From a paper:
The absence of NAD(P)+ from the purified enzyme was also confirmed by structural analysis of the immature enzyme. The structure of the immature apoenzyme was designated the IM structure. In the immature apoenzyme, the substrate-binding pocket assumes a more closed form than in the mature apoenzyme. Upon NAD(P)+ binding, the lid part interacts with the rigid part and changes its location substantially to form a hydrogen bond between E186 and R38. The distance between the rigid and lid parts within the IM structure (cyan in Fig. 6c) is larger than within the M structure (represented in pink in Fig. 6c). Heat treatment-induced conformational changes were more obvious in a region of residues 181–190 in the apo-form than those observed in the substrate analog-bound forms.
Homoserine dehydrogenase (HSD) catalyzes NAD(P)H-dependent production of homoserine from L-aspartate-4-semialdehyde and functions in the aspartate pathway, catalyzing the synthesis of cysteine, threonine and methionine from aspartate in plants, fungi, yeast, bacteria and archaea. When overexpressed as an immature enzyme in the mesophilic bacterium Escherichia coli, recombinant homoserine dehydrogenase from the hyperthermophilic archaeon Sulfurisphaera tokodaii (StHSD) was markedly activated by heat treatment. Comparison among the structures of the immature enzyme and previously reported structures of mature enzymes revealed that a conformational change in a flexible part (residues 160–190) of the enzyme, which encloses substrates within the substrate-binding pocket, is smaller in the immature enzyme. Thus, specific conformational changes within the catalytic region appear to be responsible for heat-induced activation.
Numbering used by the authors:
A (entry chain A): 1 to 304
B (entry chain B): 1 to 182, 192 to 228, 232 to 304
The structure:
Amino acid sequence: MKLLLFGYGNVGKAFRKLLHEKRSPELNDVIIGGIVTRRGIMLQDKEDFTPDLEGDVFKAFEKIKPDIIVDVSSANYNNGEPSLSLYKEAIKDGVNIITTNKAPLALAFNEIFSLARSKGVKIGFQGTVMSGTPSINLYRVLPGSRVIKIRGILNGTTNFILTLMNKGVSFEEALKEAQRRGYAEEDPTLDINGFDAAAKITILANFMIGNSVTIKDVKFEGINRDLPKNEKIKLIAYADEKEVWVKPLPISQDDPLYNVDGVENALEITTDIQSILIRGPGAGPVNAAYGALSDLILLKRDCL
Amino acid sequence: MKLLLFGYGNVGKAFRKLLHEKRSPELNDVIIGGIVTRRGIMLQDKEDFTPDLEGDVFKAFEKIKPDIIVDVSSANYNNGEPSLSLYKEAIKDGVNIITTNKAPLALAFNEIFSLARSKGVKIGFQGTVMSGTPSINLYRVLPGSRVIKIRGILNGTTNFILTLMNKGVSFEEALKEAQRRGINGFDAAAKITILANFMIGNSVTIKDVKFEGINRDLPKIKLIAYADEKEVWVKPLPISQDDPLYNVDGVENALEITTDIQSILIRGPGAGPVNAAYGALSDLILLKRDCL
Ligand SMILES: [Mg+2]
Ligand SMILES: [Mg+2]
């Protein structure tokens, strides 16, 4: 089982590590044919990235001919590239996709999944929502339930920030602390302007409801310190059959989301049978990589 | 695929209704070979139960020769019978089991599952713990992680009664108020036994659980089930405001799975006929997909 690993920051390295910890027998035949980053292509499975050749992901894909692409690269919300056209071409080749990269599914879910459905190709995408906390994969074990509405906290960075702000730390200081900790990048736009949460609710509305939505259809706002006096604020993502949105709201103590704090995330799934809530870490590179690994083993069991 | 439905109270009625609701392409070829109750054997798929033959689940097993036994009969916590010997005969014939009956698994998990593993037979058992809220099946989507500890609220009723007590409506009134919407912590004890066998690998039976139910004058207390490699117990505990279980009130279950990677918690409605039947139905589809 040959993997092409696209991306190698912290999530990529954590993925490589988990895989080599032999946590499952389904993973005995798994090889890393290559790893591709901004700095080139490494045709070897080593802990540190040293490129062997110049080139992008398309060149790597053509040279390696993997069985699976593991996509842990950064979300590009402008157009989803190069991941979007990379997924389309791989699926046509009967190449499976495992992704934590939100952008292509947030932009072109129906385009991706129809084509995957037509070619019998499997897409792991647990890592796109709530990292290693089953969200996509939770729904997989709820077959035949019809989802009515979803509601949750879907962004680790802004939750950690709004948690600190509830404790008397300023927006600015909670920002710098999220960055020192790695949860937020030097440019935290996607988190703080709410793109990330909006991407996630888009994916969930697509997969769980069956709404044919893109991130364009989502009315969203991020965080900024013009927020309510004496409230615990949460960046709430919502979707049903009719609407999908993300906004920071005052949370009351009776809400099952009130105490979902720090990098913790939660999802409330209301179905025709029941209303369930799941909670766990929303960020952390080990967590995100574990989402991808969960998909990998599931793919190996033919359970995607 | 031919089912034998064992039990036809509310859960079994709810399962038969769900199955014909055309919920999945996986369920297009599924037929009910027969339904068994304590009054006998109906060899037909109908809404109303009327016996075609007298005789027990063993006679029905022989007469129908099904592919799958769906067990939604009531828990017999004395000895797990007839389900426990039924399951053994089933597995030995290559017949899969989907169950909501806690008792056989709570009393003799290792005996059932060693047999099934050696014979290659899949068991669906989601409905035994937290009904239709993925618990057993949550851990199925957590592959390659090691479960260090479990914690939770595994009985809706006791949880609901405890909710009113701390709120003001103390033990006497809360007892009576509960019955209007309708205690020793036994039911949580069976559920935690199953969770400990499957997720931790502790070869526990119900007799190993140190369990105590609610008292009259509790000095926010919750009925808490817990397991790890060392211990399995159910104690009423005053729970800290920092707990993610603190807000789990009413007729609700919740489960905190702690692995080497992460700590996750799932919460849903406790136990109900449609919920319970949905757990069995989920397992059925999962089994059809070969994902058990
Ligand atoms: Mg190589
Ligand atoms: Mg485009």
